[PDB]
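Anyone? Bumping this.
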Amino acid sequence: VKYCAKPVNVAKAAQARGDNLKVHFKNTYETADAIRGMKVARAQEFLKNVIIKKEIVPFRKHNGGVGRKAQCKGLNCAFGRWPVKSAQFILKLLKNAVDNAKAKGLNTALLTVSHIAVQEARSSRRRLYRAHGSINSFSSSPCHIELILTEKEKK
Amino acid sequence: STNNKVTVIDCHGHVLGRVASVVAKHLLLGQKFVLVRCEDLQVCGTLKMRLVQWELYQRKRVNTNPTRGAFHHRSPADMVRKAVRGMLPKNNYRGKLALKNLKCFEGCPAPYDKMKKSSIPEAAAIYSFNPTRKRTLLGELGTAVGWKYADVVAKNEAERKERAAKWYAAKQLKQKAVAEAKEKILADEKYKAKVAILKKFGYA
Amino acid sequence: IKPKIVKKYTGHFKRFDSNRFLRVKASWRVPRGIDNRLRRKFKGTNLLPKIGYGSAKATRNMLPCGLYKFPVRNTTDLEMIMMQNRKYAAEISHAVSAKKRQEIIQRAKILNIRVLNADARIKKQEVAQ
Amino acid sequence: SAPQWFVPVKAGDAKVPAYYPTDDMIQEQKKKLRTRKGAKITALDKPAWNLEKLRKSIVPGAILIIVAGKYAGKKVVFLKQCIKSGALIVTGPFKINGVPLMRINQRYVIATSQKVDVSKVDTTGVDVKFFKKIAIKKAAFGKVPYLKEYMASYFTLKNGDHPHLLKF
Amino acid sequence: KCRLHVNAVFMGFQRAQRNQYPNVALLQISGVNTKEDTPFYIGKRVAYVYKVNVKKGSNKPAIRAIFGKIVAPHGNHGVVKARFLHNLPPKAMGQNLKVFLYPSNI
RNA sequence: AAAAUGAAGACAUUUUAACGAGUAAGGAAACGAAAUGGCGUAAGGACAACAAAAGUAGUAAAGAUUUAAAGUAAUUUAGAU
RNA sequence: AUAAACAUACUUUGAAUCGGCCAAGUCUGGUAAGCAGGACUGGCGAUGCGGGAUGAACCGAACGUCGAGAUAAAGUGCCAAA
RNA sequence: GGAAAACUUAAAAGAACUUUGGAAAAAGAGUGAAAAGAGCUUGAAAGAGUAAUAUGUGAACGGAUAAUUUAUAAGAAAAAU
């Protein structure tokens, strides 16, 4: 699976990617939307607070039946949740990209999460035995995640 | 150019419907209107006659939710606005922009009390009405249906009338003095050359 | 000399309901439904291709430059309009290689024939070249 | 002789057919575009066939108001008509109006009733030669009581002066 | 500097109850209240001068105009018909236009 | 429709006049003054650099995505990737 | 008397169709029906356009793409051109 | 009773060593004409994600006419005597 975009300067960027990750797309799509654009150090702090339910992930698009929370004030979204599994998966990719940046020799304190995209992946099927002799589909929703860190500079 | 000035209409001694029709057309022509004393307009019919019409108006109301239903404004300034809004295009930007340039007040507020007032001859009550036909002031009808601020306006208008009484008396004094001074200049010999030109064309 | 080319309708005759459904393409088809809004020529939707829309006979199939297109595949095919350079313009086919395109372009300059694909399949000489 | 449609051009050592002549006997001809003739120059006294007919109100020595162009609203004095262009040779006397000697088309002026006349103006020059002399060309491609105040001021439409009612 | 024009109101297009023909524009000249005062204005010039907030990187003028001619009277109330080079934008309905004093006939 | 011209031009000739709505339905092909005019899919037989190396193609085919042009339209043509 | 030569007379082969509906200075049964059935004609079906706010049938009028004018039914306080 | 499932490349030359990770993998590195990277020729539509641009009161979409913005796009000749 290729990357959605290429960095402007390959010498000052780092990349990490995960394919067919066993994590819900709709949860990880909203989590990756929250950390887009902030600094790597800030993003790691934000993702860690989400795990222990101290900062919200606003479910802006997929908000059907999602309950309201007190931390969703100011985000123009009345709904949010604390996806632990999806936050953990991104935390492992953010760490992996950072080690790639360090090998390149970049300055970790200057890196930001410039590009982060989530794509749908192939589903896996399972049986759900319903009434009157029926069987349904019990399908997973995996996803691919791509992460690109670039240094922030004045323009 | 651009019409920045505001046309002020004294709604005293006018007919509510005929004022609205003339105002509604000119609102679509880009003009800016401010109708003051929108409570002194007249309508055909006696007070009992007008109340029967009002109660029929009050009947219309969304049965399942009266909050969604027709809103029956009782302030005469809102009786004029309803009449004007009915003669303007509905549900388009042209209609909303035209109504944006209209204001009614129950008296003469601070900025519009010292402005040149106009009149609409087609909407005058002395032309369109038989003098024996009984009429009703919009302020009097508003009180009968529940407009609470009828006597507040009557107080504010009273002080405006007395304030305009002393200003006019002082102005009439100055104007008479200026008028007689001009007569001396006209009769003066040094201004003989300039006077004859005015007399030639009748100005003097 | 160039005549004034007048088009009676510069838009496109789109198919009915082609905007709402993606299975219905935009290529025109006459609606043959018994209750069709467009076929009955209602107000608003009464736009169908009719022979009255045809352009003037004198200036039909004429490119905006004022000449008629003439496809060419090699240098020899240019000689068929070498005597009508004021009426026809060459047009190198989409499959002619870049090598054969140079010969056609350099030959047409000799014969004074206008070519419309004169900037086709040019090599990388765009930046720093 | 060559066919009328055959205009040979030089080939920069490019491959040529057998029939096409070599460039040594091919001579270039400069491309020709213009095909129309310029206007003929007639006598200074005689007037052009393309001469507009002046309105009865515009007579020499009248006072006109320029209602369009650069000097819109200015008041000028009419001397005579340019016989080579049909325009009016007006002078809004420069010491009063600031309007120089110029040519204005007759449709952009209003002939006022006020008349200053003045014969013996000495119009010996002031013709097609003079105006063409004082024209600024490009660099080509390959290269009476109160009358003084009346004229000195702009003409403007005050409140209440509707043009269909205005007579000057 | 000076006023050499009469303000006319772009009322709308020549139309019917449910149709509209944007080729002919209807104007109300200030001071003309009847069709017998229209003959003076038949053939005069009319301009729709509008302002556009251009950017510093554009050479397009901030002030543009659309010109036309008053061609015929319309009704007995001094309304006129004007044909412009480009039909007036309906967003300009109710705005003010300029009626010049030329081409003069005086 | 009627006149005129007519071995090849060309835009299915030139001129004049009248006409042009439409469900079901009809008007197969060919027919020089053409007894309706055309677009598209695939396969078979031919033709396609006229002077003995004769349509295009690794100097980038078919296909795909779009940008523009021609045609009333069916559709076609060309550029870019 | 008036009109009629792209007039007139056709011959052959063949498609679809025979569920109809409306109007009325018309009729029959019925208390009556936006009911049932008929004589004559015009329409809707097959038909869009302008007007009657809206409407299969009402009024004007039937349609290649457009520009300019005089109009028809009908309108001219505002919505809405007058 | 009774299916579905064809294609890497010319040749496996099918990455092989380092860092991060529990591992799967990722980032470098390398092979190859080209990753075409094994879910492997091309790779449409429906459905998503990212970036750029634009809009907004109880549907949305279409058409005529202009305005704004963007894009496309027409020239090297030349007067009188």
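Late reply, but here is one note on the structure posted above: The interface with chain E takes residues 1-3, 28-30, 94, 98 of chain B (CB under 8 Å).
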